[PDB]
Amino acid sequence: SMLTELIASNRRSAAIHAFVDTGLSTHFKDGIYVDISELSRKSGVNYARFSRLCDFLVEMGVLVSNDNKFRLSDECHVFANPESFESFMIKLEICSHYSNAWLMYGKSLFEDDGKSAFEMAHGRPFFEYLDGNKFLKSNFDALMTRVSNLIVEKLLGIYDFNQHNRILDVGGGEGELLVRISEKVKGKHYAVLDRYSELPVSDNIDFINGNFLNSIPSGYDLYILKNVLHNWSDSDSILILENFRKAMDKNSSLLLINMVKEPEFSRSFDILMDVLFLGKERSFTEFEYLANQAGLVVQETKVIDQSYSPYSFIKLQIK
Amino acid sequence: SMLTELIASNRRSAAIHAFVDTGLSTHFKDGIYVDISELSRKSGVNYARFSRLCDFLVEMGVLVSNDNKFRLSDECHVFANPESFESFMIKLEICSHYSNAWLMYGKSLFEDDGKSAFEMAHGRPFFEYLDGNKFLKSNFDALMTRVSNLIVEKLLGIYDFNQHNRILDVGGGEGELLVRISEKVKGKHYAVLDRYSELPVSDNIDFINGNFLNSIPSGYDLYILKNVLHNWSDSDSILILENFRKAMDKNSSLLLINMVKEPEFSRSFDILMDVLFLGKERSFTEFEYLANQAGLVVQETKVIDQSYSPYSFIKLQIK
Numbered sequence A, B: 001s002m003l004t005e006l007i008a009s010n011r012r013s014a015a016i017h018a019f020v021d022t023g024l025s026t027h028f029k030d031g032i033y034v035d036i037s038e039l040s041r042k043s044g045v046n047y048a049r050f051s052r053l054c055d056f057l058v059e060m061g062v063l064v065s066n067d068n069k070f071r072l073s074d075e076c077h078v079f080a081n082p083e084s085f086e087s088f089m090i091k092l093e094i095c096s097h098y099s100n101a102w103l104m105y106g107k108s109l110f111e112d113d114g115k116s117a118f119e120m121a122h123g124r125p126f127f128e129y130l131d132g133n134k135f136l137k138s139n140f141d142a143l144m145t146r147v148s149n150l151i152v153e154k155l156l157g158i159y160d161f162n163q164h165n166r167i168l169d170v171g172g173g174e175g176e177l178l179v180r181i182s183e184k185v186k187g188k189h190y191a192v193l194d195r196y197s198e199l200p201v202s203d204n205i206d207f208i209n210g211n212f213l214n215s216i217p218s219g220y221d222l223y224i225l226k227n228v229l230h231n232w233s234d235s236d237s238i239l240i241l242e243n244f245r246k247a248m249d250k251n252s253s254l255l256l257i258n259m260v261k262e263p264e265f266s267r268s269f270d271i272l273m274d275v276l277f278l279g280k281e282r283s284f285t286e287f288e289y290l291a292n293q294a295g296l297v298v299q300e301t302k303v304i305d306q307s308y309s310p311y312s313f314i315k316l317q318i319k
Ligand SMILES: Nc1ncnc2c1ncn2[C@@H]1O[C@H](CSCC[C@H](N)C(=O)O)[C@@H](O)[C@H]1O
Pocket: A127, A144, A145, A147, A148, A170, A171, A172, A173, A174, A193, A194, A195, A210, A211, A212, A213, A225, A226, A227, A228, A231
């Protein structure tokens, strides 16, 4: 039935995890057709059992079959690359920590102590727990780095970064966005703020250990906040934007860059943000409402299409 | 994108789990339209956050939205009933035990110790582990009871059980099949063989502690083996059927009743059977092959329709 297969949606994620996490998918580079008999001899993977997984992956549209051999579909070519954001995504998606968070989601809907399903499962909020877990921190940071790399070219296209001199990326993680921007727009002052136990090192990037809930370093003419606000409540989002308004002078600009809620796209990410952070997906007008409450005004708006989501690009200045 | 949402398939299962496992779905009986504000007052569920889950459940087709109220779809009426097989399926599908089995699935494809992904995660094979885990045993046995209840009427319709005098259901679990058959077909000796520490009790039914890998007791004119062979390898399946042939005389009949592999249905259950049991789904032809190797021959075959799967009904006798 359609209902029992909907209940069993998890099996699709688990099948992809087995295929990608083992590195079996790396044998499918460059659109090659793989003979599972040959793959078994060199890799040691069970012929009969991996062939049955491949049949399920064909059903899913991950693999295509010809002459009893399997290739990756064009869409799923990314699974052959272990450095692809999709590879890091599947490693996190059904990991034990995420699974235990999802099992607390039901109970989390009845509590009002401001603890996410993740915190209920782990005893600390997501980013505080990641401080003590290499697997989660390295894979999450790697995922954010890959998606940052993918948006750079379009971001440099739609907005002229050459007009700015002092640039701070707030919650910029490993700093991939400004590292790539600094290679195209050379000779500016580039800074990245995040929570660092050990400072990253990269040519002409000033890495700052900080906390955007407490304070944003003042004196920059361009601030960037990319994919941060969806990890936070309305009240915490207003606090962050208030801290920007206090850091900014009349000539300063804040680029609020975020995946945006659109009716046509899936609500699944909105639920994941609830589970991990008590966060949420927001529309443009919802972001604008928070910014207006924080004492910021929209000067410019654009849409950036990415394969996986639409993005809101909102240029903010103090009222 | 389609691929990121395919990777995020687990979120669909986890959303349904939060909705059903909490008992929130029991407020949606008889296709009623629910005001989430009203539900929040009564149940104590967070209005805003549950409304967002309901938006995702509408996207999935689990809920239907009208006038900002939500009802279960006709197909998903079963979610309002905590005694439905779908309710028990949901409880097991993304439980910690299954999650940890799925996380070993990739690694299991590179080993030939004969340990399932489940055994690699939990240290014992499925049914041996269930002996010591009430959560898995109670919910698994409840699931099997519910799916047995749904097929009883169709079995009674397509086979004359009244022609037999002594009937043994082998691996019959809680004995629901014969409990229900005994209500319609009177004046028979009914027995159920399974792995029991303490014997179940039912007015019409004699429960026997046994092991179908070791021996099947003689002196029954009808034997039944329903939904057992998919938990076993081809070699173990032939051993089970050989033990039937040794227990049976020329006048004995064996009803082999099993979900059957048809090309038009999902391979997802085939992969679950690999993970839990190193089992598999089989076609009619594949079942007949095993029976023939065990020294049994097909007297009668029928296809039984169930909502979630087609079934093979095979009457077997000794050569
Ligand atoms: N209180 C806090 N102060 C500063 N950074 C924080 C923070 N809480 C979380 N973060 C950081 O916020 C980031 C969210 S993920 C976004 C990373 C990057 N801006 C990108 O778009 O790819 C993480 O790097 C996390 O470490």
